[PDB]
Amino acid sequence: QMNYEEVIKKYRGEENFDHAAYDWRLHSGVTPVKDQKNCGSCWAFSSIGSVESQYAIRKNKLITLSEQELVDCSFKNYGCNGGLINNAFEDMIELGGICPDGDYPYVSDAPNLCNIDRCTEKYGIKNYLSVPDNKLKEALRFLGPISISVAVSDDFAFYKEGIFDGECGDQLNHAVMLVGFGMKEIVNPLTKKGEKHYYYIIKNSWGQQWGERGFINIETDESGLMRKCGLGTDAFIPLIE
Amino acid sequence: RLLGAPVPVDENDEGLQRALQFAMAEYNRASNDKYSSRVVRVISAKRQLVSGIKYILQVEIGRTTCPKSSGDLQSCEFHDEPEMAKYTTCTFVVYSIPWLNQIKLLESKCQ
């Protein structure tokens, strides 16, 4: 509900930056990766991951919130049967914060009635803003990790390592986190000259065994306008201060 | 509209076949009947993306005039009299986690 141009202004101002690479994983902006398991709650893991990231960046605090509470209590979404990121944030505002996952443990598909007064203090957001599909790098650099949607395919669920560029999904279907962008020099075996390969760094919610310890790299250009699998057609980021 | 909700997925979806195949094979094995069953048709299948892949099958099963694969598997034929063929409908819920080369049968309740 806010305006990107006005927000980015106060967080960026002048401070020019390098489009080649920046990784919040090396700047206290990414909390540990979790696992949704058997239950379609990526939309929640994505959201909550974004807010934990905001606390580590702005409050210097390291907390892990409860996506269970969000799954049980977000009447805008459909718990383990899907949801939207912006609905997630929406309800966080109404609920008035979410409890630490230490008091409200995750149990995925297991039957579970919602209960808000289940922790001493809750953590919430002031509001959230949407990021233009041509500002992800800028956004990431001065605002922080972004909760995004992306179209996933089998070639994706089978990713192991490196900067992926396999086949995409049919339509947007999975929710993830954008925690940065990198760049690797790779000598073309035919011209024998090293070429620059840019990419985005994504945090998934399928555990640490998947991909590179839970993360995956996606091919992109220096400006980051190339959004493979439409990654980012849905891009939101919570504000807590 | 939603991320992470169960989607349709076509009948010839190779990933599904494998999913069904597993389900059925698992069944005949769990069944105590000396005759192996097998699917008449796939009514309504849906695939949900999660920490792995989840399938939801609605199929009509039937009893065939065959042994428990000790054969092939492989297509016999269904029993000629509908009472030995004991046709019915089942709902399978398979859960595959490929990057862990594992697969399960979460739910298999028949009518």
From Swiss-Prot, chain B:
What positions are modified (Phosphoserine)? 75
Claim: Lipoprotein is one of the keywords in the record = no
* Site entry (Reactive site), positions: 4
Q: Which domain of life is it from?
A: Eukaryota
Protein's job: This protein binds tightly to and inhibits a variety of thiol proteases including ficin, papain, and cathepsins B, C, H, and L. Although isolated from egg white, it is also present in serum.
Provide the Gene Ontology terms for cellular component: cytoplasm; extracellular space; vesicle
Transmembrane among keywords: no
Q: Which residues of the full protein are shown?
A: 29 to 139 of 139
Localization recorded for this chain is:
Secreted
Give the residue ranges of motif Secondary area of contact: 48-52
**Its family?**
Belongs to the cystatin family.
**Which species expresses this protein natively?**
Gallus gallus
Q: Know the name of this protein? A: Cystatin
The disulfides recorded in the entry are: 66-76, 90-110
- A Gene Ontology MF term for this entry? cysteine-type endopeptidase inhibitor activity
> Which UniProt keywords are present, listed alphabetically?
Disulfide bond, Phosphoprotein, Protease inhibitor, Secreted, Signal, Thiol protease inhibitor
